[PDB]
Design a binder for these strands. Structure first.
Lengths: 66, 95, 155
RNA sequence: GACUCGUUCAUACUACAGUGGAUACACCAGAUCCCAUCAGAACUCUGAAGUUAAGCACUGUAAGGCUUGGCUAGUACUGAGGUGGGAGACCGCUCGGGAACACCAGGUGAUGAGUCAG
RNA sequence: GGAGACAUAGCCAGGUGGGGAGUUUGACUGGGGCGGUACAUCUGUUAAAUAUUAACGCAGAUGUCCAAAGACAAGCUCAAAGAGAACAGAAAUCUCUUGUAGACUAAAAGGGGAAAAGCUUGUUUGAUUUCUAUUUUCAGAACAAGUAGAAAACGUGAAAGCGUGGCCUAUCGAUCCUUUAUAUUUGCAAAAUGACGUAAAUUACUUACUACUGUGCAUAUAGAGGUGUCUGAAAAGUUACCACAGGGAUAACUGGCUUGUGGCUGCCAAGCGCUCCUAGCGACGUAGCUUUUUGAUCCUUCGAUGUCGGCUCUUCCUAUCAUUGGGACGCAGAAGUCUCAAAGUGUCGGAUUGUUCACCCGCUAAUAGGGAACGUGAGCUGGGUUUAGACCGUCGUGAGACAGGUUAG
RNA sequence: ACAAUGUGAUUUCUGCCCAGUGCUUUGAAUGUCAACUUGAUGAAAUUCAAUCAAGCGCAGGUAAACGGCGGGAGUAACUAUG
RNA sequence: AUACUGACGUGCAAAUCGUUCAUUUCAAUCACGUUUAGGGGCGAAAGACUAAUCGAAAAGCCUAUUAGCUGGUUAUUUUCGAAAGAUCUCUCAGGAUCGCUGGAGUUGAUUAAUAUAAUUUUACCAGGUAGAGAUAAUGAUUAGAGGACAGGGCCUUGACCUAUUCUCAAACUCCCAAUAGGUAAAAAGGGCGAAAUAACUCAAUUUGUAUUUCACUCAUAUUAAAUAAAAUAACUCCAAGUGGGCCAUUUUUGGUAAGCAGAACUGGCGAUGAGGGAUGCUCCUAACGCUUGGAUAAGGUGCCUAAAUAUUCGCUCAUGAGAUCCCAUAAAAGGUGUUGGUUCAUAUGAACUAGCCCUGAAAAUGGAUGGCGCUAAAGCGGAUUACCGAUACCAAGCCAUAAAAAGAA
RNA sequence: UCUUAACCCACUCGUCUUGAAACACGGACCAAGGAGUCUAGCAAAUGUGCAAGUGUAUAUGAUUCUUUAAACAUUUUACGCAUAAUUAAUGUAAUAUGUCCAUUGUAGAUUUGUGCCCCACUUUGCAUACAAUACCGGUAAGCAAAUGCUUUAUUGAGUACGAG
RNA sequence: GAUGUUAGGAGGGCAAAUCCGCCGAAUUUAAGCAUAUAAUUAAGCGGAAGAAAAGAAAAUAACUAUGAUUCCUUUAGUAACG
RNA sequence: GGGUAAUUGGCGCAGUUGGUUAGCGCGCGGGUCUCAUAAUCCCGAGGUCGUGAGUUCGAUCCUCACAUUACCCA
């Protein structure tokens, strides 16, 4: 039975009520789909730097211990 | 639509290389009587109470998707290839 | 009724008068680094990588680059909320933005000005002026040059 | 003077003229081989006998076009206000923003990298 | 007596089976049914210069076609127009000049395209396998259609490159089930099925060691068979013999808005009116009024506003028919036409029809027009329309249908 | 006679059509068409074939069975009609 | 049991009464006994009848059957407080799921701050609607002028060109606003350096990339532009109700129009009183604890009716004046009514013009500027004051709620 | 307090409804009765006990036997849920022995210090948010004779000192 | 095989909560309904007892094996059916 | 979908592993009073694709169209 089929009316009024929400703007994010090649290279880089840093920290600690 | 009967293509199984395949048209064939679904259906049907299921009867489209069967000559392992529904299909016909 | 991919795009995606014909060769050379700002301007001399209507005239950060593709983080208003959308486009439509460059230029100019001021120990209001009211002044007008007026009769 | 790569992509175009060819471009000479055809026209190859006639460069024209600027015009239009006007159609005022074609005047290029020749 | 291993009966099995049973018999819908699909979609437009966005709005399209119309490279430039060349004419082919697209691009319509995306030619099959990040609609689910990549293997080009279907925007399908593919992946519930295989060993219930081990059924993974009421019930009619839950979310009745339609009044003045615009008229045109018509509408009433007409009875109106008083005239009188004040007073007998209406006949002074919930059913009447019975036709296989008639109610 | 219908005294008449749907009659020449049976294959389950049921189909019969029962043009001393 | 559609119709009766009428030796009537029972009986057939019960009797049970539908659905105060959109739905009176709401909690702010904002700014974009155009393209489309191909006799009709011309388009576009929209404005960062790390990159173990580690150092005593009862914020959970809506300005599509149908933006109304608009769901004012005084808004100030029979300059007589947004009708056309203008001519004749006024102006119960009334207006148009006038505003009290100070003799 | 007055104001409540004082419906009156419950299973919230466990089930035992049909008690692997996941499945199953240490970041509460209290440095680095790596089950892909292997992909309601 | 008022005895009916045989629905659920569902329920009809029925392995397991029947606690909202 | 049968010259039909027909018709010439008639031309993707063999329209296989019956978890 003939009944009004659309209107955007009042929707805007509801929408502003809790404000137009923003994204949460995270600094880092997942790199999952992003470029194979470059990110696998990076994984190696991080492992390399981390390994050097760990070895130096251990060396300082064991040396300090005596 | 008309497709030639042999085609040099990548072979998925027991190969890595592009090689020749023979091309044929898939067809459904007779359902096996002892297949599980048919057994259950036969049991439901049996005895009183008349027809027991839906029957897919409304019937709309007048075509059915065409599917090519690919067989590699080098290694006897077959593979399916699906493409758009067409009304008139031909294999190996006139150029 | 229908709302397909290029729906309602008639004048929007069409080129301006005398601007038909292939994307200029020079335009592929432009530099894109991660986190650079980038406009999404449609073309139609290229067909692959054409984006949907909404991302026309929008601008966002570049987050990912491929062989000829560029991922752009664009804000989209969806009812009560903005959410971030990853529009993959090809290079022909992606254009290096200028809005960032105003700020960047300002930083460079400010740094030099600040370094000199601080060296002299001369305290300074580096922040933007943001046009104030008009200050008082004294103005010579020749008494023979002034013209006097009245509203015109009707015709 | 000239060239090779380009850039802006008509102030760079087009149409009709004139003016210019050290070196350079070019037209132009030829067909054995590579090559290409219906056709050495093109293309390819091999030349260097001729020539500014053209291409090309440069300039001209109450040129067309294109391009700046004025002027069209505070006109057209318009955001906000109004227990404003008007029977209605529509039209003012207050706070604001503000065009276009035509027309008229100017303009007809600029330039990055490399190279050769007095 | 007769019939007799046939009957019959018992159980299976096919047919027949509205005789009887159970059940269903979309939705949208400017009432419903009929028509249509606006139900899945795609273009342009409506849409109000981001995005958004409606009506059974408008102009349309979709359920395909394609081994090339796909893929890549190369070469070439088209439509058309002019001027030419036996047959040769507007068309035939050939040539030159002009030719930014006026062509062609599978198909709607809009975009895009000239050393091409077009046309011609060469070589080909990437219209491939596997996997992401995602866009569109959107719940930021699904399918579908894409965009950007990655791991493979290739195709083309000298090479950069480009190629993961069609220049871009449309061309479509869940679960169960079936079906056929894939695998050095698995199962069939206490066990076994290649094979006593390969070595040994002794005479046996011997020891080591082996990715590959019956039929059938099942899984896992991947397609395909279809649901167009297109996010997916297997579904025909009828009731004026009917019931019940509700609905003024919704028709048939008034009133209400509007007044297309009807009715009534204007304004213009080309003409008509013997000559003469206006005595009387008045086209071509144009402005209003009215709600006595018919519509459009669906605001009010469906836990009932008694649904036509006649009879009777009263009052109101005036857009005057008569009567009274006037004015104008194409007015001699007479007869009369138009017109102004006028609603005081009046406005009939019948034939025929259920009739509003209509048509006659006759009287007449004239037989004006209307209103009051279409005035008037606890005033009547009940002829009509609108219950159950019935008839005839057409229509329907039927039950039954009929803004067709007719009769008892 | 029993059963089942239609019509409805008398009188006078009871035309056309078996295509459609019914109803109905023949059959081992005959297409299909079930269980069983019977053979073949297989280690077996299975899987295959084959046989004279009726029925329908094939060939007829039937309207006091249901029912049904056309359209355009042109043509006569006037015109008209046909 | 026919007719009176007679009596009665809260009856004499849940079918009676009066009068009229059909029936009487047969298909006749009655009594009693007897037979047949509920999807059954029986029927000279009306779906009739089967004990006031029949298109499926009566009784009890399955059974408190079932109902997306109707009605109802119980003390107070206090706090916060909706929706009538959206997607899918054999879906349009429903449901699901989003949206919008409350409670609970944590995190964070609690440092006039950074986060942040229905805002502007300065930068920077993106646009193709109003508009504008036709001699810019496409489609329309009216005219002539000047020229060098077709029919007839230099000439005629042309076609055809060339420069022009009149008017145009939601589905035309050279060009093109306003409004609306996006991105920008620095410390988890940015600078300029060094050094490291990688299987990536590149010719390049240093060619880059990116990360990482060290350095040096960028505004901050107003805060890398303003402004901000800007953290009353984030975020999580659990759940509600709702998913029929409607009206005004402005934009707007269909329709002759409509208190009509359909949209866009915003505000309302709904759920909202109070003061004003006489009267009223939506108009104006203004949003409401309880009070006292003050001063106003919107609106008024002849009386009804609280304020002025105020002041000041005009206009207006109507034998159907006129009088307040929405809002409760009036036009084309006339006027030797009066009032101003404006243009012409020789203190007049002409021609126009717009104020009020008049004509045009007809409807039904009696009758409505809100009523009485009003003409030196209480009318119409101004201007000037003064005043009266709300649950709004200011001051003060009192209440609760919310937060804040702040407290273990 | 009640009672009339008087000025001014003041429409039938309930109700479904876009809109009710309605020519919408229900209500003659009065009194009493008269409508979101109970169980099952699940969830979150919050309270409470215990805590890698937890619940003492059914049942037994007691000088427990009006109340008591409750309370009390339970000789050093019963069962539920938890404690580990994942795959259709035979099944397989969490860094890894260089170390009783407890994967890496960036923010980030709490702490230490310096130059009894605001600062600004430093210092430790929770919760949590965002990532990143490892590794486990399934699946790919590469290899393959094996206690199957792999630097690579993926997928899971997975894991990285418990929380029920 | 009959027959007997032969001699001695027995069964019939009432009562149903629990209990045992049959026979057997539908409302209902699925937002419709046809298979399923309601439910081996209700109604119908037969038969017992102070309890009845069941019971002394044609059982389960696949273990270091258990060991008539019934019931409780449980496995378990699981294997499974649809 | 099963199973069966039918499609061969203008028309209508036979035939199947050592074959492309017969009749009607058409065309044309010959012929008895006019025709019946004889003779010769006409004139064959044997529905389609592929295979099996000395040899196939024929047989095996493939497929469409027409026909008749029956199935319809499709």
């Amino acid at each position: 039975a003939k009944s009004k089929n659309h209107t955007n009316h009042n929707q805007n009024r509801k929408a502003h009520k809790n404000g137009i929400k923003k994204p949460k703007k995270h600094k880092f994010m997942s790199r999952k789909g992003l470029d194979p090649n470059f990110f696998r290279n990076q994984k190696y880089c991080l492992k390399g730097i981390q390994k050097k840093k760990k070895e130096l920290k251990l060396k300082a600690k064991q040396e300090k211990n005596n | 639509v008309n497709v030639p009967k042999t085609r040099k293509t990548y072979c998925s199984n027991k190969c890595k290389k592009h090689t020749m395949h023979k091309v044929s048209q898939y067809k459904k064939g007779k359902e096996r009587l002892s297949s599980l679904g048919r057994r259950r259906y036969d049991m439901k049907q049996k005895g009183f109470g008349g027809q027991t299921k839906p029957v897919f009867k409304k019937k709309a489209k007048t075509t059915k998707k065409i599917v090519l069967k690919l067989e590699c000559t080098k290694c006897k392992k077959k593979r399916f290839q699906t493409m758009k529904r067409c009304k008139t299909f031909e294999m190996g016909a006139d150029k | 009724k229908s709302r397909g991919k290029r729906s309602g795009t008639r004048y929007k995606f069409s080129k301006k008068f005398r601007k038909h014909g292939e994307c200029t060769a020079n335009k592929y050379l432009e530099k894109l680094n991660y986190g650079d700002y980038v406009d999404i301007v449609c073309d139609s001399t290229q067909q692959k990588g054409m984006p949907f209507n909404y991302y026309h005239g929008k601008t966002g950060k570049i987050f990912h680059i491929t062989k000829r593709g560029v991922g752009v983080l664009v804000n989209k208003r969806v009812k009560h909320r903005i959410e971030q959308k990853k529009v993959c486009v090809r290079i022909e439509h992606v254009r290096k933005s200028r809005c960032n460059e105003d700020f960047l230029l300002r930083k460079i100019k400010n740094a030099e000005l600040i370094k000199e001021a601080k060296l002299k120990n001369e305290h300074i209001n580096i922040k933007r002026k943001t046009e104030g009211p008009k200050p008082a002044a004294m103005i010579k007008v020749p008494p023979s040059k002034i013209i006097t007026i009245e509203p015109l009769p009707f015709y």
